Amino acid sequence: GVGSSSGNWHCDSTWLGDRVITTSTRTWALPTYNNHLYKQISNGTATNDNTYFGYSTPWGYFDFNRFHCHFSPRDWQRLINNNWGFRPKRLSFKLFNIQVKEVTKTIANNLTSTIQVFTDSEYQLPYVLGSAHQGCLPPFPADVFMIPQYGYLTLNNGSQAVGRSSFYCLEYFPSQMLRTGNNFQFTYTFEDVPFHSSYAHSQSLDRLMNPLIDQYLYYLSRTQTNTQTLGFSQGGPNTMANQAKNWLPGPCYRQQRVSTTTGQNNNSNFAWTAGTKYHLNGRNSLANPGIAMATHKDDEERFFPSNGILIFGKQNAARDNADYSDVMLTSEEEIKTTNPVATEEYGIVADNLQQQNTAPQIGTVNSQGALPGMVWQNRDVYLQGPIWAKIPHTDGNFHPSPLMGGFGLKHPPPQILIKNTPVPADPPTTFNQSKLNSFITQYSTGQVSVEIEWELQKENSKRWNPEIQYTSNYYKSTSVDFAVNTEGVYSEPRPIGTRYLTRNL
Amino acid sequence: GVGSSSGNWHCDSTWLGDRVITTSTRTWALPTYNNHLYKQISNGTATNDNTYFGYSTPWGYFDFNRFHCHFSPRDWQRLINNNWGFRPKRLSFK
Amino acid sequence: GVGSSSGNWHCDSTWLGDRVITTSTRTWALPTYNNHLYKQISNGTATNDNTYFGYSTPWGYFDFNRFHCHFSPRDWQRLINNNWGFRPKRLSFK
Amino acid sequence: GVGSSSGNWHCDSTWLGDRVITTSTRTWALPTYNNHLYKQISNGTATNDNTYFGYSTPWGYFDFNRFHCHFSPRDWQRLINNNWGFRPKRLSFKLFNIQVKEVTKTIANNLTSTIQVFTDSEYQLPYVLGSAHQGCLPPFPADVFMIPQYGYLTLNNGSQAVGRSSFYCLEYFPSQMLRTGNNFQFTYTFEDVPFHSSYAHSQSLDRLMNPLIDQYLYYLSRTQTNTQTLGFSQGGPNTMANQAKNWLPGPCYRQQRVSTTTGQNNNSNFAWTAGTKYHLNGRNSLANPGIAMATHKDDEERFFPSNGILIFGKQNAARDNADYSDVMLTSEEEIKTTNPVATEEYGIVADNLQQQNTAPQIGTVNSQGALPGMVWQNRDVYLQGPIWAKIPHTDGNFHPSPLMGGFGLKHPPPQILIKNTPVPADPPTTFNQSKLNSFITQYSTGQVSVEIEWELQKENSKRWNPEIQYTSNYYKSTSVDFAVNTEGVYSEPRPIGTRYLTRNL
């Protein structure tokens, strides 16, 4: 009905046992995108690394692939201070209280206009969620947000398409059409995904041994008396670097080190030239943030990999060339215990065969793929960070955990595509075969509810001393952190990670 | 009802055994034709080969008598690359 | 029996739903290999990269580990133009 | 078993009511064709009219698509002198007493060798039966015949193939393999086909009226008194050509007239240049024998259409340039009553609009397609002639009766393909990937039985005077017609048609 609400506001979080159910409602506004048209979009030689061919669609899409879309900062604190892990279990999504409005400036209700909503439940469309794009549900529930426009990329050769390039018409899908009295809803069940490691290791991989007992294994301790010899010693509490060990640190893809103290950096523009990159079809792309490696070693917080960390912008940070004070650098220092430092070499290997005439030579391993016995931690998730990514449908993957963090899903939450149904203006009174291009200017607004049930891994720890916990600062300040200022602007002052509790290795 | 949709968007093609079911939805616009009038229309001697007598009506009509109204180019490729023949069986219109 | 066939020629491909059953028959000829002997075979330093030690046996073996042993080119076209994937399920050998 | 017969000799004809069951057994010999190879065969510019692209296969095939394969001359006489029509109903086919022989010259039994037999029951192979080819079962049961080699043609552009050209491997079919103790058999049911008209009409199409009564309809009898006028007369017994009539003679595709008295023919080589032809894809082919038309009119037996009749060769007639005395011309004069004469025009049509200043002009119709009210007879079948043809699988056909006579079948008796299974000679003792080309020289022989049940249309005639019947000549002769001569050669002295009884129109 026109005069009856099609749904209620549901913003809440219920903690019950090993589950937390976050539900969040937001008010959205969907404009008409592309003037109801599908437009081919391209970029040519811009450098070759940035070329693309794709399509802009008249469809919007709903994104809730950030943790702050579901967790309030206090709820995030509850989660990270008390749980060793968490994972999504199921979600329910609702569209309701839809209002389609005609603008001629006067804005009027168009009671008979529709919106079209469908979920790509078969994953037949290019999945553009999981690319850390803007347009997600705002962290602050009172915030009204604009629905982002759906577009996708296909195969390109410069600015040109190839024969394998795919064009998708989203109208070629079954869509529910909704008038102002209608509502849309669907439920989704997450696949069995591993718990995110919401903990930092309280032991280092090279310090898993008893510090009081010698090893019964020997290591080559000396090769020279001086003349050649072979001296063997037992690894013990003092020669702990020489001890036989069962495991290796995780893989390494070395990144350039950048200091937040700019005077310590090289006086050159090396963000791209020295950037750590991968090469794909003659195109260079940053390995950003790349594989999960420790941001820095001990007492080197000022250092970060050049493109090896998630960088969030503070409120009102510039899109381009934001200063360091306008951005929020994350740090994966919690995984120092298992993952190699992002800006350091993995290790040292022999580069030759030493003889009595040739001294042994060593090679510095700046990139190390998977080795047996290697263990590693994934990148941390953040309150502002992504939740899930679609695992690409390929023959093979290795540890398909998304590199910007979160849960890798073969069948992620489906894309929810929404569009204002075009309403033609008055057509001519004589028939014209040409497609109509005169449309009533129109936009829709409504409420969107997303409810996610998360399973929790409770910490079962015998640690005696108190743990590190995320806490708000006790000292006075002009404004409350994670609140609005005097102008009503909600801001997130820092990126809240997830690893505060500790586990043994 | 004014505020309730009377139907959903159904564009799809389902291939099942020896059948393919194409469904296509379009948005149409119908003007007022002829100012609601029936008009006699004619053409005289124009050559005699092109003469006609008929009527223009205030009515529109729905035409879906082209294959691309129902088959996407990919669906057409699926049909023509794999089948020796095809024929329509039934239609539903909304 | 000497005068009775022990099997029929079965070259065919049946496409049924999500399965394709390829059957192929060939005429083979098996000689006597190695004069019924097992022979040690070797290769020495030829470079070291190509050295080997092994045995030649008087046995033959049946190989059908190529796709064209089972798919005609037209069947291969049917498979690759219409399917996102395929995998063997079972085989029978005669 | 090696020492047990796999079937008996069954040559017989049983007449029972409205059915006749012909069964015929023959001894066949199948060589190895093509040295077990499939060979591409072509012919280029030979004229363009004779170009082809195709394949020769190592397979033989069984043909029994001639009436004398099933009917003895006496049985044919029984059929044609007493029945208004007949049609095949079902057939059973048998291969048995197979002997595969090795030739090294000494010929020995190869008891373990096989032949491969299969029927193209799905009509997936090019159907080469119904092209009036040699290699059918011999008319004389004592005659041992060689199995013809199977080959087919596909699309050609000169001697070249096109992308649409089809290659068929007959080994790609399931075949029954038969050793000397095995037999092969299958049954086939003919589709509902019209009875062949085993009768000639005793009335002419233009003489269906009562010769004693005038018509009540008038015809324009005079246009001139002299001055213009309009005089109308009633068609009657004397103005029988002017009478209103309900039907038209069958369609016409005029053929050139040739006299068996060669002195009456033009002194030129016009068999091809004046031949009646159709044009297909830039290729000219004789319309041979073309549509069923009367061979000649009354008292013109010496005349025949140049390529409009079936011509059978007498025994030992030359393949090329056989004299008229060595061939047997058929005659379709029985269909004069309904079909136009093959060498005459269909009729006369107006070519202009007559006025007081322009005299009326007439056009001679030398080719007339189907008109409403047209009736016609098909070509007669002959004891030596074909029985059936496969109706080509097309969107449209008009009166799909085969032009050389017989029954048009959408699903004719399937091709029966037979091949000696290749038996390799001794392979080398070291492996060679190349296909084996050294084979034991081999041929097979056996017996083939084909049983066809024919349905008969009994004549139900009130004709008072005796009918025309096919009869042997009473007068003495050196040899019996349709018998062997002193050398054991069976000969068919004349083509026996089928139309001896009469029906009214």
Side-chain angles (χ1 to χ4, degrees), chain A residues 2 111 116 171-177 179-182 427-429 436, chain B residues 1-5 7-9 11-13 27 29 31-33 72 75:
Chain A
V2 162
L111 301 179
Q116 302 178 46
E171 282 79 355
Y172 199 32
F173 291 74
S175 304
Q176 169 166 330
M177 329 192 54
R179 287 194 175 177
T180 184
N182 299 121
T429 53
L436 300 178
Chain B
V2 162
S4 185
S5 199
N8 290 315
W9 193 276
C11 271
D12 218 5
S13 74
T27 299
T32 284
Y33 279 123
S72 75
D75 277 319

Side-chain angles (χ1 to χ4, degrees), chain D residues 393-463:
Chain D
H393 191 281
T394 60
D395 285 333
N397 55 60
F398 178 66
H399 196 70
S401 185
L403 285 193
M404 338 169 300
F407 305 91
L409 310 169
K410 309 214 91 43
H411 312 285
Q415 298 183 111
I416 307 141
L417 290 312
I418 186 171
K419 184 175 70 77
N420 298 323
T421 307
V423 177
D426 45 328
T429 53
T430 165
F431 170 73
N432 191 3
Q433 71 161 325
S434 160
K435 77 169 172 190
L436 300 178
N437 49 42
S438 182
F439 293 102
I440 279 167
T441 317
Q442 194 152 280
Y443 74 97
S444 55
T445 170
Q447 271 75 55
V448 51
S449 277
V450 52
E451 188 188 57
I452 301 191
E453 174 180 277
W454 312 79
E455 185 181 12
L456 307 172
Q457 252 202 357
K458 261 72 197 69
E459 54 97 13
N460 154 77
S461 186
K462 294 301 293 228
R463 171 172 166 134

